[PDB]
């Protein structure tokens, strides 16, 4: 379990509210304010989910072997409604749970501004919006299309050797879709208002 | 990786043909023939998939920690069409690819207690050469309840704690004959049985 996690008194799940003005809070706030400087941040929480982390780190080590090194990880955004936050904190992102034009997977945005749309980060009865900062194993990617249930093969002659993720645009991606459970770790939860 | 496996010389995947007369072949043949005595086995292959094994064993250790000294794993059957065998061997069981079962207890991957269920042509579709295909699968059934057709995840154990889930669902808790799982890496395809009429 990572150094920068704080002690969990022998528990396997906790949400840790970050201290404003310290290096970690500042780093996550800056990633958000790059595109959402007009929004008000109420708090940022570190998600310490030992089991999700374990499963994710196994998939990362596999993808690092499969892709023969390569930086396979990106930090992306995911807006969610308040009613889904408890499920995501405990279980992560589930493709079985908006437009799915690039495939039937879980969608992650490059820009917080995209995830900040009310269609994704639905304001709750108090006006509070929720967005995750997510470690995503995007790996080697290709353009997606409607109706994919997995990424396409890297070569149709070997139909089981797949891309890791798909995107809207390979040259200048703004969203990524992953189709498997172990490929996204929700690292921080931002609670904010318009 | 398990010490019983063949040396794969740094490779991540192999199918190993078992020999009749070995305990390993004979136990699977007996488990199959208990309910499929009218069919004949062509061959039994051990599936050695390092990455699927690693991810499955992590989920088993997690369920063993979470559950109270429960036997979380059952050895179950899953009938497949020939076209799906290469994908399952490499990538396991994807709920997003699953057919609607004739009796639905949820939108997940189905596994049978009895080989006779998986041996139905609806599940183990005979290929162009009359070969039928069935996996023998380690499944993390964990703590289970009777399923229902609307489910896309297992139900909560307690309605006032919606995130604390059953591990799987079944058709009948007192006499389970099928299990449904809703997550990746909850089922490891261990053997492939090729068989004919
Ligand atoms: O942050 C997100 N949260 C959620 S919750 C349910 C969906 C999303 C989501 C979807 C996103 O792309 C969708 C799309 C598809 C085709 C063309 C343009 C856009 C992008 C981001 C999100």
Swiss-Prot record, chain A:
- Per UniProt, residues of the PARP catalytic domain are 1-194
Please give the superkingdom of this protein's source.
Answer: Eukaryota
**Where found in the cell?**
Nucleus
Q: What does this protein do?
A: Mono-ADP-ribosyltransferase that mediates mono-ADP-ribosylation of target proteins. Acts as a negative regulator of transcription.
What family is it from?
Answer: Belongs to the ARTD/PARP family.
What protein am I looking at?
Protein mono-ADP-ribosyltransferase PARP15
State the organism named in the record: Homo sapiens (Human)
């Amino acid at each position: 379990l990572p150094e920068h996690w704080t002690d969990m008194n022998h528990q396997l799940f906790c949400m840790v509210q970050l201290e404003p003005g310290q290096s970690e809070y500042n780093t996550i706030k800056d990633k958000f304010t790059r595109t959402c400087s007009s929004y008000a941040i109420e708090k940022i929480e570190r998600i310490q989910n030992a089991f999700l982390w374990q499963s994710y780190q196994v998939k990362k080590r596999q993808m690092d072997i499969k892709n023969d090194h390569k930086n396979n990880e990106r930090l992306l955004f995911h807006g969610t409604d308040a009613d889904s936050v408890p499920y995501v904190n405990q279980h992560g992102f589930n493709r079985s749970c908006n437009a799915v034009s690039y495939g039937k997977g879980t969608y992650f945005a490059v820009d917080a501004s995209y995830s900040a749309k009310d269609t994704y980060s639905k304001p709750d009865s108090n006006g509070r919006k929720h967005m995750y900062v997510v470690r995503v194993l995007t790996g080697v990617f290709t353009k997606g299309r409607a109706g994919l249930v997995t990424p396409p093969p890297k070569n149709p002659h070997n139909p089981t050797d797949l891309f890791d993720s798909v995107t809207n645009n390979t040259r200048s991606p703004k969203l990524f879709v992953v189709f498997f459970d172990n490929q996204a770790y929700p690292e921080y939860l931002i609670t904010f208002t318009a």
